[PDB]
Design brief:
part of a larger assembly; 7 chains; A: about 450 residues; 6-stranded parallel sheet; 15 strands; elongated; B: about 100 residues; alpha+beta; 4 strands; about 25% strand; binds 2-carboxyarabinitol-1,5-diphosphate; binds magnesium ion; lyase
Chain lengths: ~450, ~100, ~450, ~100, ~100, ~180, ~100
C-alpha cells in the first residue's frame, strides 16, 4: 500500500530551488562528510534527521504534509550547507527545543564525520516568543546609576578554598577600591570550605559597606548555580532577601531549562542575571566540529541573560578579534547585517529584544585596557581577578589601578586620541597620579599572551 | 564620596570638561546639566538645570550654562549628562564641579 | 607581604610525587599543548584553572590551605595527564558543580590547543551523595513484569508532523504488535501540529488499549522536555495523572540542573525516566577535543536516569564496539575495572547505586538482532523506529517482526547455539513461522552500515 | 447504538456507500476501512483493515476491500474513513456494515 | 493473551522447556514454577507451586515438578521462573503450559 | 545496610533490639567507626565552630555562657532581667534550662519576646555581640519549628534543642530549619 | 565599649602585646593589624593596615607596624589578629590601642 524501503535523503531534503521565507529558521553548517558521501546527501541527512525524516520510508509519512514541515538544504557553498527550517517546527520560547532539533542527533551520524553549526538566522516571529534579558543594558545602567564607561568587575581568588568571612574580606577590598562588581568563580557553588548561605550573607555585608564608604552603587555576582533547579531558586531567593542587585548562573552547566527558570525568577524579583559560559569551549573552539559561540550568544540573548562572557582576545583564553566584534554586535544591537569578515553568515534582526552586556575576563591586566576599550567600547564589563588580587599591595590597590586605567583610556578616547596608537602613553600619563597603577604596570609589563 | 565616571581621575579642568561635551555633541547625543547637594547612591534624580539642551549646537553654549549653574549653586555637585534618545538611555555622565 | 607576580603553573599544580587518595576525584585528560608549551605546563594549567589557581599569584592564596585543596597533575603518560581533585572541592550531589570545575574553562586556554576529557574516577564517598536512577533495571523489570530478554521499543515517525490522534494510532499499532514501549522523538515537545497535552491524552488511550488487548504491560516514553523546568514538571504531572508508567527527558538539552529536578519528581510520582542523549555528539564526537560519552554516562547514572541511549555499533550513528561495551558496563555493573583499550582509564566502583538500561537505537533492523543480543545481553532496550513503521505492511507487522527476532535469538542463545556464527540461520528458522519477519528480512537485507 | 455520520438515515445500500467512496476519492482524500465489535463511545481506535488505501484509484477497489472485511469479520461493525493529510485530520467516517445482532 | 518472554514463538515443547531450565541451572540461578487462572497485566503475583527450587540439581527434577503442577492445575497457565539472589531479581520467566 | 543521612536508621539497627536478648545479660555499645562514604551523606553542623566565631566576631578564648536560674518559676519579664544582667556583665550567651519550654508561669512567646529585648540592649550597651539559647524543645516537630520561626523573626542568632528528648528525627528537622533561617 | 578578647583585663602594655604576638608566631599563625573608628558590633570588617603579615619573622617587626598604624590613625581602635590558614579562621584577636 506504500513504497517501503530506503531512499536517499537528498530526494526529499535537498531543494536548491527553495527560497527561504522570512519566518524560516536558517542554519549554516560546515560539513565534513564521510569519504565518498557528497555534500548534497550529507546536508540532506542533517536536514532530514533534524526535522521529520529517518533512515527508511515509513507508511505514516503519508498521514502528514512533509512538504510543509520538512527542513531542507537550499544552498551549498563549498563545505557550508544552508538549511531552512519552517517556523512551525519549533516550540515557542524553548531554546531546549531548538537544540533538540538542530543539534540533537545530527552531529553523531556515520555519514557526517564532523559538523559545525557556524550561525543561525533566528526569524523575528520566533524571537518574539522569547522574553530576552530580564534587565538589559539600559535598565541595568539605570539601576546602577553608571553611564559613560566600561564597568569594572573581578572574580574572587583563589577560585576555591577561602572561608565565607575571608571571601567577603576580599570582596570588600575590591569594591571599596573602585571595582563596580565582584563575582563568585563559576565553580564556587556550595562546598565544605565555603557554604553558600554563609557566603551570601557575608558578601552582602561587604557590598553594603563598600557602597556606603565609596558612594557608588556596588554588586556581587552571587553564584546560584546548583545541582537542581529548586536549589538554584532557593539560592536566588536568599540573594533577593539580602537585597543583592545580582545573581549569577553557569547557564551551560546548569543547562538551558534551569537557566530559563532562573531568568523568570530574576525578572519577577528584580535581580539582574550574570551568565557565565562555563563548558562552552568543549564544543565552540575547534573549527571543524561543534557550535560556534555566536550561536550560543544568540540563544543566551533570547532566554534572557543580562551579561555573558565573550572573551578578551588578548588574555589567557582563546578568542578572535573579528569574530568577537561580531558577537558584541549580536549581543547589543537591534539589527546586525551579515559580514563574512566577522563570520556573520546571516542578517540578524533582534525584534526589539533587550541587549546583553559583553563581559571580557581572563588573564587581563592594566596593559590590556586600551585594547579592551577599543574592541568593546563602553557597554561592557572588564573583569580583573588575578589582575586585581595579584597587585603587590593587594586587592584594594589593584582595584584602584584597574578603575583608573579604564577611566583614563575612556577620557582619552573621548578627547579624540587613538587609544591603540597611544595606549601605553595614556596609561603612563594616568600612572603619574596613581601609584597603584604604576605598580601594576611594573609588575605585569612583561606578561603577554599570543 | 566618589561620583562615578572619571571620579578616579584628577578633577577635570574646564578644557577637559569641554572636550567631553564636544564628544557628546559629535555623537549626536543631547547634553544636559544636573545638580544636587545629595549626590549619594540613594539619589537617582538630581535637579535639572533647565531642560536637556536639545537645541545646543556648540560645546561653548553648554559651558556657559555650566558656569551659570555653578554661580547659582556653588554648594552643589554639578554633573554633565549626555542622552541618546535612540537607545532611550544616558550614555555619558560625570561630575564637572564639586563644592 | 607576599611574592607577587606570574609563576609557571607547574610550580604549584604539577606534582608527580602525589599519591591519589581513595576520596580524590581523578581525571584523565588527553592534552595537545600549544607548540612550545611543555606538557607539564599545559597539564598544570588545566589542574590550576579547574580548581584553585589563576594566571598570577594572589595575596589571598595564603589565607587558605592550597596543599589541601589544590588539584594536582600527578602523572603524565604519553599525551594523557592524570589530575587528582580533593573531595572537598565538590558540592555534594551536584553534577553541575563537577562540570563547572572539570570542564568549565580549561578547554579554552591558549596554552592548550586541544583537550579531551577521556574518563574520571568518581570516588565512592562522593557517589553516595547522589541518588542514582529513580527506578533502576531490577525494579523496572519488576514494574513491567518482564524477565529474560532485551526489551523492545521504537521512536514514532515521521519525527514531527503527525497530529496527536494519528500519532497515537501509530503507537497503538506498534504496542499491540509486540513492542514493549514506544517513544516521542527527542525533538517532539509541544509544537503547532502536535501539542503536548493532546499527544499525552491520546497516546495513553492507545497504551491502555494495547495493554488490555495483548495482556502485556506497555509504556510510551512521553517527552516532557521543555523550555523551563516548571514546564517540564507540569508535563510530568499530567503523564502521572494519566497513569503513564514513563516519562522521557532530553537530559543534555534540558541540562543537568533541570534533569535532577525531573529525576526527583519522577521518583516522587511513580514514573520511570527514559533519558535521551540529544546533543551528546556535539561534545563527544572528536577524539582530540571534547568529553567522551563514557563521562556523560557516569554523570547520567549518578543523577539518576532509568535508561540512556548508548549507541548500536552497527546502526546509522557512530559508536565503536569496544567503547560501547565499556559504556554498557559503566551503566549496569557494581564495579568496572579499568581498560584503556575501551577508554576506561580508571576502575569505577559504583557504591551500590542502581543500574541504568542501555538503549540501542538508530538505523537498526531485524538483521542486526543477533549482533545486538551478543553485544548487550538481556539488560537493554533495542529500538526500531524506521525499522518498525517502515515494514511493508506497517507498524503492527513491523513490531511483530522485531519482537520475534529478539525472542528467537534469545531462545537459541539459551539453548547453547552460537548466535554470531548462526545468526542468519536462527532468523531464517524463525521467519518460517513469522511472515512479518520474513518480509522485514527481505526488505532490509541489503541495508548495512560500516562497523 | 448510533454510529455517527449517516446513522440517522436509513442504512446505506452498497450503491449509496460507493457514492460516498467516490466523494472521498474525488476530493483526493485517502479512503480507509476499520472494524470493531465494540463500537461505543469509549472506543477511539477501531481495528484497521490493512492500511489506509493510499494507492487506491477507484471506488470499486475500496468496495472490494469492504466486502473482504465483512466476510472475514461478519460479527463486526465496519466503517469507511476518508483522511486528508494536508489538514492531518479525518474528513468523513460512516458505518457501512452493521452485524446481524445490531 | 500474550505471556511475555517467548510468547511470540511457537509454544515450547518439553525438550525446549528443558533446555531453558538447563540454562537457568547452568548460570547458578534458582528455578521456580508459578501458575494462575488470571494471567493478565494486573497480576504481579501468580500462585507458587511449592517454593523456588533452591535444592534442585537437575533440569529433570524441575520438569517432574512442572508435570505435577500441570496435573494439579490443568486449567491454569504455568510459567517457569529463574531467580538470581545476587541481583535480587528474576532473570528469566516464560509460560510452559497454557490451558 | 544503612539509609543515607539517617541517624534514626543507624539506631534502629545497631541499638534496636539487641540489648534485650535473653542470651546477652548486659550489652554496652562503646564506639562505632562511621565510614567516610556514609559520613558524606550527612550535612553536619548548620554553622560549625569557625563560621560561628565569624558570626560572633569572637576569637582567641573560650566563650562564656550560663543557664538562667531558678530553672523554672520566673516570669518572662524577670527571666529577661536576669538575661540582661548576665549579658551586660560580660557573658557572651545565656540559655533556657533544658526543661524550660512553655509552661503556665513562663510561656514561650512571652519569654522569647522579652529575652530578645534584653539581648539587644546588652549588645548595644557592651559593644559585643550577644545571644540567648532560646529553647524551642516542644511536644511535636511542628511546634518546635513554630518556636524557631519566632526566634528568627526576632533576630536571635541562636535557638536551642534538647536533641535526645525531642529525638533524632525532629532534631534533623530543626537542624535543616536552623540552617535555612540563619540560626 | 568592650572589644572582645582581653577587654575585661587592664589595657595591655607594649610588653604584654608583644607576648601575644610571640604566641601567634610560635603557633605558625599569621599576625595582622586592623583599625577602625567604628568598633561596634555592627562592624565585621575593620580597615586592614597593609596586608596580613605573611612574611613576618619576629614579633618586633609586628610591633613596629603597630606603632606605624597608631601614628597614622591615632583616632582609631587598633587590633592585633592572628590567622590560621589551615582552619581558614582567626584564632586570636584583641585590641592593642584605644584612642
Ligand atoms: O576562572 C577564571 O579563570 C575566571 O574567573 C578568570 O579569572 P582571572 O580574572 O584571574 O583570569 C573567569 O571565569 C574566566 O575569565 C572565564 O573565561 P571566559 O570569560 O572566556 O568565559
Ligand atoms: O531520531 C532518531 O534518529 C532516533 O529516533 C532513531 O530513529 P530510527 O529508529 O528510525 O533510526 C533516535 O533518537 C536515535 O537513535 C538517537 O541516537 P542515539 O540512540 O545514538 O542517541
Ligand atoms: Mg572563573
Ligand atoms: Mg529520535
Ligand atoms: Mg539545665
Amino acid at each position: 500500500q506504500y513504497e517501503a524501503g530506503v531512499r536517499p535523503y537528498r530526494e526529499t531534503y535537498y531543494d536548491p530551488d527553495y527560497e527561504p521565507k522570512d519566518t524560516d529558521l536558517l542554519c549554516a553548517f560546515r560539513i565534513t562528510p564521510k569519504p565518498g558521501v557528497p555534500m548534497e546527501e550529507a546536508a540532506a541527512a542533517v536536514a532530514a534527521e533534524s526535522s521529520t525524516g529517518t533512515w527508511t520510508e515509513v507508511w505514516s509519512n503519508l498521514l502528514t504534509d512533509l512538504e510543509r514541515y520538512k527542513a531542507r538544504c537550499y544552498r551549498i557553498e563549498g563545505d557550508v550547507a544552508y538549511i531552512a527550517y519552517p517556523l512551525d517546527l519549533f516550540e515557542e520560547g524553548s531554546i531546549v527545543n531548538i537544540m533538540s532539533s538542530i543539534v540533537g542527533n545530527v552531529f553523531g551520524f556515520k555519514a557526517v564525520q564532523a559538523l559545525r553549526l557556524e550561525d543561525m538566522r533566528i526569524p523575528v516571529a520566533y524571537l518574539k516568543t522569547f522574553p530576552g534579558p530580564p534587565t538589559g543594558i539600559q535598565v541595568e545602567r539605570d539601576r546602577l546609576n553608571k553611564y559613560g564607561r566600561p564597568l569594572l568587575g573581578g572574580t574572587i581568588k583563589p577560585k576555591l578554598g577561602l572561608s565565607a568571612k575571608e571571601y567577603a574580606r576580599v570582596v570588600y577590598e575590591c569594591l571599596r577600591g573602585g571595582l563596580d562588581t565582584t563575582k563568585d568563580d563559576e565553580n564556587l557553588n556550595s562546598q565544605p570550605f565555603n557554604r553558600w548561605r554563609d557566603r551570601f550573607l557575608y558578601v552582602m555585608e561587604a557590598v553594603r559597606k563598600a557602597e556606603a564608604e565609596t558612594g557608588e552603587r556596588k554588586g556581587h555576582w552571587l553564584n546560584v548555580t546548583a545541582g537542581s533547579t529548586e536549589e538554584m531558586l532557593k539560592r536566588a531567593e536568599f540573594a533577593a532577601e539580602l537585597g543583592s542587585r545580582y545573581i549569577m548562573v553557569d547557564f551551560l552547566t546548569a543547562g538551558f531549562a534551569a537557566f530559563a527558570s532562573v531568568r523568570r525568577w530574576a525578572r519577577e524579583n528584580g535581580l539582574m542575571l550574570h551568565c557565565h559560559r562555563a563548558m562552552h569551549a568543549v564544543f565552540d573552539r575547534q573549527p571543524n566540529h561543534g557550535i560556534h559561540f555566536r550561536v550560543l550568544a544568540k540563544w543566551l540573548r533570547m532566554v534572557g541573560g543580562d551579561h555573558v562572557h565573550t572573551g578578551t582576545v588578548v588574555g589567557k583564553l582563546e578568542g578572535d578579534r573579528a569574530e568577537t566584534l561580531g558577537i558584541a554586535d549580536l549581543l547589543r544591537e537591534d539589527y546586525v547585517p551579515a559580514d563574512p569578515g566577522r563570520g556573520l553568515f546571516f542578517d540578524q534582526d533582534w525584534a526589539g529584544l533587550k541587549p546583553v552586556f559583553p563581559v571580557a575576563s581572563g588573564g587581563i591586566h592594566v596593559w590590556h585596557v586600551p585594547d579592551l576599550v577599543s574592541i568593546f567600547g563602553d557597554d561592557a564589563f572588564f573583569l580583573f581577578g588575578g589582575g586585581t588580587h595579584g597587585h603587590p599591595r593587594g586587592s584594594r590597590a589593584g582595584a584602584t589601578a584597574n578603575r583608573v586605567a579604564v577611566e583614563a583610556v575612556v577620557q582619552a578616547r573621548n578627547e579624540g586620541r587613538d587609544i591603540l596608537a597611544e595606549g601605553r602613553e595614556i596609561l603612563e600619563e594616568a600612572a603619574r597620579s596613581c601609584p597603584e597603577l604604576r605598580e601594576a604596570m611594573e609588575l605585569w609589563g612583561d606578561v603577554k599572551f599570543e | 564620596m566618589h561620583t562615578e565616571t572619571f571620579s578616579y581621575l584628577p578633577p577635570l579642568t574646564d578644557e577637559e570638561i569641554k572636550k567631553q561635551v564636544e564628544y557628546i555633541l559629535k555623537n549626536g547625543w543631547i547634553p544636559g546639566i544636573e545638580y544636587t547637594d545629595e549626590p549619594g547612591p540613594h539619589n537617582s534624580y538630581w535637579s535639572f538645570w533647565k531642560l536637556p539642551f536639545f537645541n545646543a549646537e556648540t560645546a561653548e553654549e553648554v559651558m556657559e550654562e555650566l558656569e551659570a549653574c555653578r554661580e547659582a549653586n556653588p554648594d552643589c555637585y554639578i554633573k554633565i549628562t549626555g542622552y541618546d534618545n535612540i537607545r532611550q538611555g544616558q550614555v555619558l555622565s560625570f561630575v564637572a564641579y564639586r563644592p
